[PDB]
Structure formats: C-alpha cells, structure tokens
C-alpha cells in the first residue's frame, strides 16, 4: 500500500476473479475489471478503475493479470498480428456501448431487435475470440475487419449512433483529422454504406432474390452442382447416362454430358460413384442465367 | 371448456350379450343410455343395472365418469352399483361359505369403486361382513375346525373388503366390532398364519391405529412388540413392512414419555440391529416403503432424543452440574490435582477460569454456560455419558489435549461438544418429524442404537485429528466446526453402513490426500461452467433481478384488459388494471371493453394498497374456484384464475387473458410483496442476460486463462507512504 511508482506499463490492470473488500477501494472484482493503474508498488497495484477513472483500486499484483502494454496492442506489439487489435479494443468499447443499450432495451419492448442485437453481438464476439490470435490468414483477417465493421455500423445506425470510418485496418486511421475533404468523403462513403444496409435489410427482410442477383452481378462463373442418387428403373442391360444442359430457347445443347455407367441390375455399373454421383456444371455466365427457358 | 367427444364409437357389452359397437351419445342423461343398452339385450330395469368400463375398472359408469370412454373403450352392462351392492349384502350376512368367499373377494376388489361404494355404504353391508366373520364363525365352527385354511382365507378377504371400503370414509371406521379386533388379535398374537390373513390383518392394525389413538390404545394390549418381531422375521418382506408400520404408528401415538419407554423396548428387542441383520444387511430388497420404514425407525430414535435436544434443562441444576462435574473429573483430573474434584467455590472458580481460558470460553465462571444453550443442552452431556461407557479414550484425550492449550487453538470441549452435537443432529436430522417425504435410511445408524453418540465422539475425534492438520483455532471455532461439517458431508455422502465403514470414511477425511480428488472433480465440473467465475456472476445478482422487477412494474403500470369472473353474458372480459406510478394503488374494476387497453383514471376499483395484500392464490386455490355452484370454472382457466388477497374478505378473483402475463403479474405483485418471481420468463431472461454480462467481463483476460484458485496476497509496505503519490 506504499512505494508506488509512476509508470504506464500497467493500464492493463486486470482483475482475476472475485476480489475482496480487504482494501479501501476493493470488492468482488469481475473478470474485465480494468483499472488504469498509476501507482506502481511491487506486490500491489492501485490505480484508477475503468468504471471510475478518478477512483483507485488497490489490487494484489498477482491478482493483477497485468499485460505490460496499454489498451493498445501494437506499440509494443501485443497484437498477435500487426494492424488490427486497435480494432478489437474499439470493438470492446462498441460492446460496452451495446451494454448500456441492452439495459435500455427491456425498459421498452422492441425485443425483436434485442434478439438480433444478441446475435450480431455473438458473431462479433466470436470474431473477437477467433482473432484473439492470428488464427485466420491475413487476408481473412481483412475480411473479418470488413465484417466486424459492417456489423458495428449496423448496430450504430440501429441505435442512431455516430458513423465509424476507415472501413479496414482500424476504423480509426481516417478520423485522425489529417485532412478535411478526404474525411468529408469518408463520411460520405459511410453514409452510402448505411443507405446500402437499410435498403438491403428492407429488401432481404421482405424480398429474397434481388440480393442473389446483386451478388451474382460481380462474379459470373457459376456451377449447378448435382449429386445424382439412383435411376429408379431396372434395365436388364448395360446403360449409359448422359447429363447436359439443353436450351429450348436456342433449340440446341449447352454443356458436355456428364457420364454415368449403369449395370443391367438397376445398379450403376460403377459403384465407387453410387455414393459420389457428383457433377458440377460450370461456365454459367450472366447470359447463361438470364436466358428465358433452360 | 369443451365437453368430450359426445358421440363415441364404443363397444357395449353385457354378461351373455354379444357386444355391439355403437356410437353412443354422452350428453344424454345416462339413465336413458342404460335404458337403450338394456333394450339392446331385450332388457328393462335400467336403473336396476349399470354400464361400466369393460376395461379394468369395472367402475359403474355414472353421469360423472362418462367422459372417460375412449373410441374403443368397451362398455359392459351389469347389475347397478346398488344391485351389485345388494346382491353382495344378502350374500354377505349369509352363511353358505363358498358363496361368501366369492362375494367377499369381489367386495374387496370392488370396494375402491366410489359408484358402488355409495350404495353399499347406504346399504350397510360392511356390518354384514361383521356378521359373516364374527357370527359366521360360530354358526359353523364345528367344520370350521378343519376348514380354517379356507375360513382364514374368508376372514382375510373380509379384512380386505372391510378396509378397502373403510379407506373411502363414507362408511364409518367403527363398523368393525370388538369381535373383529378379537379375530385380528387371534392373528397377530398367534404364529405364522395364511399370508393373506396376516398381511391384511396387520394392515387393519395400522389402519385402526391410524383411525384413533384410542383404537391404538385398545389394541396395544393385543399389539405387542415381542409378538410383533416375528412379523419382521417373516421372510415375506411385507410382514416386515407391516410390523414396522405398526411400530411407527405406536411411536407416533405413544406419548413421548411412553415413547422413551418403547424406545428402550425397541433397543432391547434388537429392532435396530435385528432389522439391520434381517432387512438392511440381510438379502431382502429394501423397497421404497421398507427404506422409509428404516428412515422412520432411525428418526423415531432421533425424536426420542428430541425431548432432551430442544428442551433447555437447567444449566445450574445441581444434579446435572454434578454430572458435568464427574464428566470433568474423568476429563480433567489428569492435570487437575484431585483437590479440585471436591474443590471449594473459590477453587471452583479458579479451575473453571484456568482451564476454560484453556477452553477459550467467553464466560469462565460456569461450564454449564456451555450447556445453557439448546439444542442439545444436557443431550451433549448424554453424549459424553456415552463416552464414559464407550469412548473414554476419546473423551480423555480430547479434554487433556485441550486441558493445557490457553491459546486459541483451544478445543472448547463444553462449547464444542454442545455445538457439535447440535450441528450433527441438524445434519442427521436427529429429531425431525418422520414423514414419507424422506426415504433414505442409513445402515450406519442401524448397526448401533447410539450410532449418533459414536458419530459425535468419532467426529470430534476427527475434528481434533485434522485440528492438528489445519492449525484449527477458536476464532475459527465455528469455522473449524464447519470444516468438520464439510468432512461429515464428504463422509455421509458415501452413505455409511456400519461403525467400521463410518470410521473408514472419517479416516478418509483427515486431510491426507483425497481432497485433491474432490477439488479435481470440482475442476472437471467447472470446465463447462467455471465455478469461481460462477461465484463472480451470481454474487452480483441483485441488479438484474431488480431491473427485471421494475420492468414488470412498468408492465403493471401499462397493465392489460384483465378478465373477470365468468366473463360470459355481456360482462367486461376486458378491463384495465393500471399500476400507479406510486406503486401502491391499482386502478381496475368493471372497466369497459377497451381496445387501446388502459383508460388511466380513477377506475371502478381505483385502489389496491399492498398494505392489505396477503398473497395471490393461483388456480383452484382461488376462493372463487372453491365455489362449486353458479361460479364453477373449468380447470382450463387454472392458469388464468388468480385471487389476489386483501382485506381478508375481498379478493381479486379474476381471469388472465393468457399464461405468460399471468406469470408476469404474479411476479409483479410478488415484487410488490418483495419476494421471488414465478415466471419461467424471469428464469430465462435473467440467466441469459447475466450470463452475457459476465461473458462481457472475460474481456480483460482473453487469449490468456484465469487462475481458478485464489492466488495469494503479495505483501505490501504496511504504511501508506506513497513513492508515487495518489491523485
């Protein structure tokens, strides 16, 4: 409770389990009871709690699951992988904002959105946990940045919150007041994204095909995956099965006939495929889709 | 609310009659249905005959149970319950035997039929049984002398039919005469007899004992316990069940003063040990009733301990003071020079205080202030008296080892003995009311009448043994007894069966190694649930429950269009019950059929103070449900019918519109009452929400796991002298 040192390597004041009121400013600490500590005694750390940043907590150093870094993860590289974990910590703040929201959500009954709140929350926190490490490949981490950004801004517009910017690698790089017009158009872009989400949520909430068309607009290589099962008939003779796409609109063929052999016994003449009677018909382009009769 | 399928595709039968599968109408008065059924077999006399389930019941269908005929439920015609009852009775008071045997087995079987019982009890054919088995012996006894196997079967079937009508209670329990109990005495007081007779007769014994403490008294001359041991010895388990049922009825209705008598009687006739060796530790299956029999036996011993347990026998009583004086002589005179055995009052005070600061007593002027509190008081004294007979080694060694420890590791043998006896009785439920609720029997108790006394000596022995193993202290006095209680838990959870096995279980407990196994299981069971983190979560409980409650307070304020009594004929099935912001006044009553719901105003019953609210009885518990006339409510409104209590004379006897909000309002009024909730909605929401919250606490640790156990406390500089200041 004495011999305190000024340092910044302790802002991860990390409670372990139920703490005790043995200390003037202490209680049954939760898990994430972060104290932004200022006073460095060896065996004990007392410092300003996350909950109350003018109120200290005097918590045993062993009970302090200290991580030397501050809430950031890159200055000393506590990022398991560089360039994101600022994103995860701002996600944590996002979550503690969702905290006060879901307290203010049973006061009314919109609980439909309260459900979807918890579910998007669960998706975000599982992305959080999976990106506790560099578990994904880096490009997949960029993908997850995109997805978490998407979910986050969704929640924000739901609560009519602010706009986050800098889609990728932080959400924070853009808003650093380095320029103006770039920032303006960043806001412009984010409002675009909000428009896109409101439109799609209306049009995926109610319609169910326009989403598929919009996604198929970008890429145009598609494949009809058929797993055939068994040709119900007994033949008594060898048989040959051919599977191809015909165009009555064009009065002609389209694809190559996938082949199956058939024994005379109502049985495929090749049995290693009987389970695996699998063909994938590719090359399906935007035109291939939009043809009237196929 | 709906009636059953009024047109049911069922077979109708009758003795001699080919069944006809017709589509019977059921709203018709059943007399006419009986008429048409009779007509089907070219029969008249419908009121003289009853249809019944051709299925197992044979219960003569009345207007009441005709809802119980399913598609395929065969109906069989027969004589009406009155006509069966009569045919019986004039066969019953009669004397021709085999006919009586058939009618008597059948009166047995049909006694449970309420529909039959109505007219057989109106009839008084049970007194006709009284004839057939108290006169019917002496009309015939010359040939009964040899037929007595079959006459015993007779009177046993009479016992069956008699009691199987008695249990319904419409016929008096007084139909048996002193000649009936005379025959029952001829059974119980004699040797092994035809098992039906002995069975149903012991059953009558316990039943008539149950009817009256006076019947119990006037059969106790015939029901004696030594003659009642053979019923246990009867390898038929049920004879054992009946002997012990009679025994437990004896102790239930013997006076506690006479209960100690019959307890010494039980101890000397070996009931504890003879049942252990002949039921528990014999090969006989301990059926649920039998395990309950043993539970009641041990707890009867325990509630004979109760009279000394609860009562606070005078701490300064001269006799008990000299008996704790002799206890403390055989306890202390080793380091107590024998001049204190007859020590004077000044020396009595000196020795009290000297070895009672060695016994850490807050008051050192009296050992009996360590007996001035009950439970048990002079019963812990009784324990040490057992020790003077059975565990003098234990008593001497404990007292001597605490006869010199002035420190707070002191084991206060007066205070520890008294409190340990009381806490382990509360563990063992020594002295509780024996009920069918508990069916657990400990064979530990039935290998020793005083297995409670050896329990206390050996548990205080373990207390002192581990007391060395865990630096046990007297500021931890209650704490050390609670660690000993934890050990008692880990032992009794293995279900001790004998003194040696109980001693083995306690020797397991002396903090040697197996504790790591129990905490390793605690590890494996926190794996899925994180028990210390569960501690974190459920410790900060109150916020979530109180927010749910104020949420429901909101909901009560916005209330609903509640539903009334019999909202049938142009009555407001919709009427608002607004909770005021004051949350002391509910605005409701005959409010119109409101679409938007609440008209916030001084309603027809604008007031409802919590000050007169008692509770809400929910369902048939509602006083309006207790009405069975022009306010009958079908059991489908059970979940909507609530009766909010107030004034002790006016209640909110109303109907909910559905189930969930019924639960909600019950919850809300209970929060008003300041008690727990009774919506499973509350369970689900509270658990999911608080679990999420704590799941929103795992953040500061993540990618790194928690120390499950408490880490230590690293040392401080004791002073507060800040090298880096605060602020």
Author numbering:
A (entry chain B): 1 to 294
B (entry chain A): 1 to 727
Give verbatim lines from the article:
The dedicator of cytokinesis (DOCK)/engulfment and cell motility (ELMO) complex serves as a guanine nucleotide exchange factor (GEF) for the GTPase Rac. RhoG, another GTPase, activates the ELMO-DOCK-Rac pathway during engulfment and migration. The DOCK-A (DOCK1/2/5) and DOCK-B (DOCK3/4) subfamilies specifically activate Rac and have an Src homology domain at their N-terminus; the Src homology domain is involved in autoinhibition and binding to engulfment and cell motility (ELMO) scaffold proteins. ELMO is structurally divided into two domains: an N-terminal domain (NTD), consisting of the Ras-binding (RBD), ELMO inhibitory (EID), and ELMO domains, and a C-terminal domain (CTD), consisting of the Pleckstrin homology (PH) domain and proline-rich region.
Therefore, to define the RhoG-bound structure, we analyzed the crosslinked DOCK5ΔC/ELMO1FL/Rac1G15A complex in the presence of excess RhoGQ61L using BS3. The cross-linked RhoGQ61L/DOCK5ΔC/ELMO1FL/Rac1G15A sample yielded a two-fold symmetrical reconstruction at a resolution of 3.8 Å. However, the ELMO1NTD was poorly resolved due to its high mobility. To address this, we symmetrically expanded and refined the particles focusing on ELMO1 NTD. Through 3D classification, excluding the DOCK5 DHR-2/Rac1 segment, ELMO1NTD was resolved into several conformations. One class, comprising approximately 12% of the particles, provided a map of sufficient quality to define the structure of DOCK5/ELMO1 bound to RhoG at 4.9 Å resolution. Cross-linking mass spectrometry confirmed RhoG’s placement within the cryo-EM map. RhoGQ61L formed a primary interface (∼440 Å2 buried surface area) with the ELMO1RBD and a secondary interface (∼260 Å2 buried surface area) with DOCK5C2 (A−C). Consistent with the previous crystal structures of the RhoG-ELMORBD complexes, the primary interface involved ELMO1 residues such as Lys9 and Leu21 interacting with the switch 1 and 2 regions of RhoGQ61L in the GTP-bound conformation. By contrast, the secondary interface consisted of aromatic or aliphatic amino acid residues, such as Val232, Phe345, and Trp400 of DOCK5, which interacted with Arg127 and Lys130 of the Rho insertion region (α3′ helix) of RhoGQ61L.
